[PDB]
């Protein structure tokens, strides 16, 4: 046992490897997203950074959960990170819409994390969620409807005007 | 022989010229697109200064190319500048579109020209293209493919709006 | 087609899709270094520290090839991100050795990717892989054997006197 | 007809293109001039920036013409720009004597065009000529007069220490 | 082997020594004619000041192939250098054509350097090669054609004058 | 003869000829030192810089006793800069003793250049060698030989510890 773990569960710690893997994922689905819409073919260089910023985000909520298992006394093990489930994300109102259903999936699995914390009555591992996720994903998943809604109501994907000038209005 | 000349072939001199006559013709006909849109009837300011910009950034290509025709001991010899293709360019659309396919004209005959470099061994003229030429023409071509993109994806040239709304946000 | 593609060979373009694997992978690995040494029972933060920094520039080099396959109009296509060889690094002086074998490997694999990029006359990514990657390499694996040379030297990994001064001195 | 176009003669537009060859063709031969005395065996760098800064102005002499044809309603014909009549232009003093004849060349032809444009009675094209064309050329012959005077009672061609001296004291 | 020895062929190994020894002995060879120039019967501090310049790059240029040398795992064995072939240089004319012979016996060692490292695959060398050493000695053969050529125009070095003002006005 | 030369005894101007060639000789020694500590297996990077910076230090004192060759109107006669004793310096120890072995050798030899000095009755040159050189070497062997007494009580060469605290916090 480490030294400074204390009322840490294992069923905890097994779940945080999970938040990490998927935390990893998700910025590798976002970083998809990116590079798709740098394409020449596709070419809004908003889209691009917009989902490279929410790349870099996930990557550092997955290393804020490695910080907080080393900090728990717990052990990182890593898995592999899967691929995205597109390679071609199709319009920037679908990568929005995937984006979202993604968030969502994400805030499922932490609230289910919140859930198993207060189970084991760990209220430290129960603040963490609280603090750094629980608000960050409804802030997320927020501005992200607000943003399909956007899309489609300015006529998007069929569009092209409207999501160019979505580009370059709301994420520029 | 010139007393600097040093393992500088004659056939990559030749080719050199050749590359400056086709850098001057680039200048001319990127002169001649941004004073189409300067027309009253046309009326894009823009535009106009994006191509006039591409017509200073030729010239200087070909300055390039003439200095290093004498940093090496080759002579410059000079052959009339044709006049471009075309009086009137239709469109920003079209436009963009010749201004591709120029770019890529330029392109070939400078990967050529690497050949030829490569085929004599002369490894310094090899470094100049590389270092000076083959990025930039790279760039050039991505850009004036988002471009075409963009514009095709708004509703351009059918749609005047298109080409006034990319006028003003993506080349202003 | 891409309206950009020129001279890019579809062998090139699979080589870098699987250059881009190997950069993210060689980032997760010094990110599962990292937080090793982040744990209560190993505790060298300049060793955490520096394995970070390594980690987020790896995920920087892969970021720079989905440009540069955009760039040439190639398409960009993920696959998974392989977990790390080990979770358990085991001392300062066996991450750093781990590290150089890694860093070798991938100037391998750079090494292989500019001789195919020779093989079909490409000089554009010659060009890319000698700018942006080789120096790089060797520059990394000079330092990466010189950290290795001087663990041994001062004892490691036998000496946690040995590792701590290191932590301390050389990398913090 | 253009929109904008008043009492702007038929005569008048035409004499307005075949001006702009005319800057065109001048900014040619000064920049012939320019890598002439940028060569190893030549080797006079203030001779060479010399004429390199008037190729640019006759560069811009031609813009202001092109801008002068699309403000009147004028529609610009653009026509080969002929290489200039020498590549050896064999010292100092016969580049000077060379650029005296080609600006009182070019003066004559814009006297020519305020004699055409007094004769249609077309005073905007009149003042445009005399505020932007005629001292600016009265000027350039003067200097050019004066280079050739100077040169030639230094003892050029003759003494390649005179243009050496003329080279460093009257161009640097 | 070295630790970080990859692609570094034994050959490549001897020829980065042999080249270390050539700009050495360039080194010393500028440092002669320097103080050639600095005697009281000469008397050039400029073309003194010129020469020693040179020969601290040199020294440079030996330096940057001996961290080469040891970023690739080679391994450094010193010559002798050898005295120059002169004492006394004669004058700033032959003192010139002199450096431009040595820094082209120089280029050709590089070029050679460069042919050796394609063919044994080795673009890290070739890529240093080219950057570092390449473009510096054809800017350094241009400089001193361009000086040979305005001091054998002024009249050196029969004219002690001209070696004086070329000596204050273009090394100064 | 020179006409500014006065009291200037040719053994002098030998003696002053062989002591320019001793100091030249020992900036490669330790340039040579400078180099082997920069090798990735023995990896001491300031043990590098303090041998560099002692390197451009010879070659300084050389330099300087080549201006005062011509200031006496003396003539500098060059021979071979023989390769240094060792291409492998073994330790910071063994090439600190043998640094203050050379020192102490050109201490000698500078002492011997008094001593002729006076001999021939040359105070300028006496209170040169006084001024510039024989306080230098007296603090230069001090420095040395702290050093050596310093790596010997630390443990060197056996500790590779001492070595690397020793260039951490003494030539750091
Ligand atoms: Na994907
Ligand atoms: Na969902
Ligand atoms: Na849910
Ligand atoms: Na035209
Ligand atoms: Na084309
Ligand atoms: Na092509
Ligand atoms: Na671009
Ligand atoms: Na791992
Ligand atoms: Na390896
Ligand atoms: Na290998
Ligand atoms: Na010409
Ligand atoms: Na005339
Ligand atoms: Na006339
Ligand atoms: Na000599
Ligand atoms: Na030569
Ligand atoms: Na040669
Ligand atoms: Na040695
Ligand atoms: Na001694
Ligand atoms: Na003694
Ligand atoms: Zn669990
Ligand atoms: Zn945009
Ligand atoms: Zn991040
Ligand atoms: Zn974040
Ligand atoms: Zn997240
Ligand atoms: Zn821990
Ligand atoms: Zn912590
Ligand atoms: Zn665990
Ligand atoms: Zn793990
Ligand atoms: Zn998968
Ligand atoms: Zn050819
Ligand atoms: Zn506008
Ligand atoms: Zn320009
Ligand atoms: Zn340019
Ligand atoms: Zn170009
Ligand atoms: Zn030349
Ligand atoms: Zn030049
Ligand atoms: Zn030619
Ligand atoms: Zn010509
Ligand atoms: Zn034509
Ligand atoms: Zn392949
Ligand atoms: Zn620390
Ligand atoms: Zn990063
Ligand atoms: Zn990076
Ligand atoms: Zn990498
Ligand atoms: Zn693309
Ligand atoms: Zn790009
Ligand atoms: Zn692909
Ligand atoms: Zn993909
Ligand atoms: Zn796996
Ligand atoms: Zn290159
Ligand atoms: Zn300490
Ligand atoms: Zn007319
Ligand atoms: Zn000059
Ligand atoms: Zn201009
Ligand atoms: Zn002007
Ligand atoms: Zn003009
Ligand atoms: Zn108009
Ligand atoms: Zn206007
Ligand atoms: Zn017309
Ligand atoms: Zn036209
Ligand atoms: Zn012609
Ligand atoms: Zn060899
Ligand atoms: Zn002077
Ligand atoms: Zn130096
Ligand atoms: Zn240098
Ligand atoms: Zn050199
Ligand atoms: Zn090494
Ligand atoms: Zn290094
Ligand atoms: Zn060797
Ligand atoms: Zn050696
Ligand atoms: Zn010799
Ligand atoms: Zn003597
Ligand atoms: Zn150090
Ligand atoms: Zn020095
Ligand atoms: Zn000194
Ligand atoms: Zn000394
Ligand atoms: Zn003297
Ligand atoms: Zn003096
Ligand atoms: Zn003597
Ligand atoms: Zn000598
Ligand atoms: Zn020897
Ligand atoms: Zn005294």
């Given at each position: 046992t480490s030294q400074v773990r204390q009322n840490y569960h294992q069923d905890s710690e097994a779940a945080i490897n999970r938040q990490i893997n998927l935390e990893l994922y998700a910025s590798y689905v976002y970083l998809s997203m990116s590079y798709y819409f740098d394409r020449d073919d596709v070419a809004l260089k908003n889209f691009a950074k917009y989902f490279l910023h929410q790349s870099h985000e996930e990557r550092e909520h997955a290393e804020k959960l490695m910080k907080l298992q080393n900090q728990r006394g717990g052990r990182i093990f890593?898995?592999?990170?899967?691929?995205?489930?597109?390679?071609?994300?199709?319009?920037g109102l679908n990568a929005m819409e995937c984006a979202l259903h993604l968030e969502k999936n994400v805030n499922q699995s932490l609230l289910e994390l919140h859930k198993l914390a207060t189970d084991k009555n760990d209220p430290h591992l129960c603040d963490f969620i609280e603090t750094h996720y629980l608000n960050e994903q409804v802030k997320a998943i927020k501005e992200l409807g607000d943003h399909v809604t956007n899309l489609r109501k300015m006529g998007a994907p069929e569009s092209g005007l409207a999501e160019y000038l979505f580009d370059k209005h709301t994420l520029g």
């Amino acid at each position: 046992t480490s030294q400074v773990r204390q009322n840490y569960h294992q069923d905890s710690e097994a779940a945080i490897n999970r938040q990490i893997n998927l935390e990893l994922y998700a910025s590798y689905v976002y970083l998809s997203m990116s590079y798709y819409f740098d394409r020449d073919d596709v070419a809004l260089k908003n889209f691009a950074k917009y989902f490279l910023h929410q790349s870099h985000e996930e990557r550092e909520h997955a290393e804020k959960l490695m910080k907080l298992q080393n900090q728990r006394g717990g052990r990182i093990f890593l898995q592999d990170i899967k691929k995205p489930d597109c390679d071609d994300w199709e319009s920037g109102l679908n990568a929005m819409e995937c984006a979202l259903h993604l968030e969502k999936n994400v805030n499922q699995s932490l609230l289910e994390l919140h859930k198993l914390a207060t189970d084991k009555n760990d209220p430290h591992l129960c603040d963490f969620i609280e603090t750094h996720y629980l608000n960050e994903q409804v802030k997320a998943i927020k501005e992200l409807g607000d943003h399909v809604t956007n899309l489609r109501k300015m006529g998007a994907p069929e569009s092209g005007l409207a999501e160019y000038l979505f580009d370059k209005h709301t994420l520029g």
